[PDB]
């Protein structure tokens, strides 16, 4: 039982160590997507304002 418990907790270290490394990989991918959308949103918003102003003049 004690040896099986040692194997259980060791297996949980590895599995949750991988899940931590996988989470950091995904967190970077999401941060790239966010900053892609943030930059695209500001580019579009300001372009529509300037386009609207040029239509009057």
């Amino acid at each position: 039982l004690l040896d099986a418990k040692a194997s259980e907790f060791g297996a949980r270290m590895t599995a949750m160590g991988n899940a931590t490394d996988n989470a950091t990989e995904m967190l970077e991918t999401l941060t790239l997507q966010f900053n892609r959308a943030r930059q695209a949103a500001i580019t579009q918003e300001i372009a529509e304002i300037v386009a609207g102003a040029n239509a009057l003049r």
Binding site: L32, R36, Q39, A40, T43, A47, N54
Partner: protein, 469 residues
């Protein structure tokens, strides 16, 4: 002379009255010697983009026709010289004395004018020459983040053309002038400058000169292509050119789109790289090889400008950041890098030895992020990685590359430790150059691999003398 007068000017863009008989895209000269480009011919006026400093140009300033379509000087007068996009010398070694000129804008070779790429352009870099081989007339994108080894691939490729009768053109667009000065000094030390033309439009230079720089370098390469010779052009980089063209387009109030770029931003690069080609026997058989650069942000190959240039070129060499900052240089990403020409751009020996080398390493890196059978592939993989590592400014002859790759792939370094593989390679080639020179010379002359049994004995003969850690 036929004169005009500036009526409005701002941000290097002028409106000129007069110049009645001026052509569209004509070279113009202002009072103070600064050059200009007649972009738009309007009903009563002319739109002029200033191709230089504009702090002495104003309303009332006069400008004259040259009678010439936008052009640059070309030929052997530019060899070993540093110039701007107009062909004016920056090195301070006197003027460019030449009678030959070629236009900035020029049509690409037609459908019947070309031939399929079948001649090697050896970079001298093991990772590239084996896995992503470049041919004469090919367009191969070099793409990757800031400080991932892009310029070093181009300079080492240029250095490797010494004694190969290939003219080189290094076009610097939007780079620091420090680095271009360093590049020309590196070429001087390796005796690569005397067959190389350096076109430079630095980051302090106004945007229209960054815009024109690749086309000026292309024209200089084209001269040699259409006369039967072979040339290599490097655009370092097209991200600076694209951004410079966006500035010009936004100053002209042209409608912006994706990432604020104009609708003809793909056409900016597509007409540039179409002019790089391999001509037919009827047209002299010459070629122009293109190595355009794109600098990604955070490794994002799916962005607008990167996907434009991937859509133009004949494959690409992606440089991985994580590999580059963990010992692996050059940091070639085997998974997404590819050469469309492939085996046709390699000699017979290199093709046979490194036939499946890219997919074997792609499989290795997949298995690394994860038994006895797969354990042997990991051990073989680590050793092949050490062979493809290479110091900067040290090109390797193709006969030496194929021997080095032959040894590691057939298992002559499995009993040797991983840390000794780089030294094993270096000492094996010293043994091969000094003693067994006939095996190397067979590859040089024919292009084919030597006798299998004779080469295996020569490697095993060296292994007796070698001593591991």
């Amino acid at each position: 002379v036929e004169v005009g007068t500036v009526i409005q000017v701002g941000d290097g863009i002028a409106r000129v009255h007069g110049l009645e008989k001026v052509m569209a895209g004509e070279l113009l000269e202002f009072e103070n010697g600064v050059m200009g480009m007649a972009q738009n011919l309007e009903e009563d006026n002319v739109g002029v983009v200033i191709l230089g400093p504009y702090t002495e140009i104003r309303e009332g300033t006069q400008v004259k026709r040259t009678g010439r379509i936008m052009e640059v000087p070309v030929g052997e007068a530019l060899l070993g010289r540093v110039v701007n996009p107009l062909g004016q010398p920056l090195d301070g070694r006197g003027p460019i004395e030449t009678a030959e000129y070629r236009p900035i804008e020029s049509p690409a070779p037609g459908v019947m004018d070309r031939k399929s790429v079948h001649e090697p352009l050896q970079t001298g870099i093991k990772a590239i020459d084996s896995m992503i081989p470049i041919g004469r007339g090919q367009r191969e994108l070099i793409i990757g983040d800031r400080q991932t080894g892009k310029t070093t691939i181009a300079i080492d490729t240029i250095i490797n053309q010494k004694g190969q009768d290939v003219i080189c053109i290094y076009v610097a667009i939007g780079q620091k002038q420090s680095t271009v000065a360093g590049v020309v000094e590196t070429l001087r030390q390796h005796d690569a400058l005397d067959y190389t033309i350096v076109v430079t439009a630095s980051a302090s230079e106004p945007a229209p000169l960054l815009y024109l720089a690749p086309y000026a370098g292309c024209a200089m390469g084209e001269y040699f292509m259409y006369k039967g010779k072979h040339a290599l052009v490097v655009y370092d980089d097209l991200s600076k050119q694209a951004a410079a063209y966006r500035e010009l387009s936004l100053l002209l109030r042209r409608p912006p789109g994706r990432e604020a770029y104009p609708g003809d931003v793909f056409y900016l690069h597509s007409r540039l790289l179409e002019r790089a080609a391999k001509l037919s026997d009827e047209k002299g058989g010459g070629s122009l090889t293109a190595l355009p650069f794109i600098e990604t942000q955070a490794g994002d190959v799916s962005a607008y400008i990167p996907t434009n240039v991937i859509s133009i070129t004949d494959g690409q060499i992606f440089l991985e950041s994580d590999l580059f900052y963990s010992g692996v240089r050059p940091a070639v990403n085997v998974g997404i890098s590819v050469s469309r020409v492939g085996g046709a751009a390699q000699i017979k020996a290199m093709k046979k030895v490194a036939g499946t080398l890219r997919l074997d390493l792609a499989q290795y890196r997949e298995l690394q992020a994860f038994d006895k059978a797969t354990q042997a592939k990991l051990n073989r993989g680590e050793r092949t990685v050490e062979i493809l590592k290479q110091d900067e400014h040290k090109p390797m002859p193709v006969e030496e590359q194929v021997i080095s790759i032959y040894a590691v792939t057939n298992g002559f370094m499995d009993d040797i430790p991983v840390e000794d593989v780089r030294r094993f390679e270096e000492e094996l080639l010293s043994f091969m150059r000094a003693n067994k020179d006939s095996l190397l010379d067979h590859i040089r002359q024919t292009g084919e691999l030597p006798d299998t049994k004779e080469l295996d004995a020569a490697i095993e003969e060296f292994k007796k003398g070698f001593t591991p850690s």
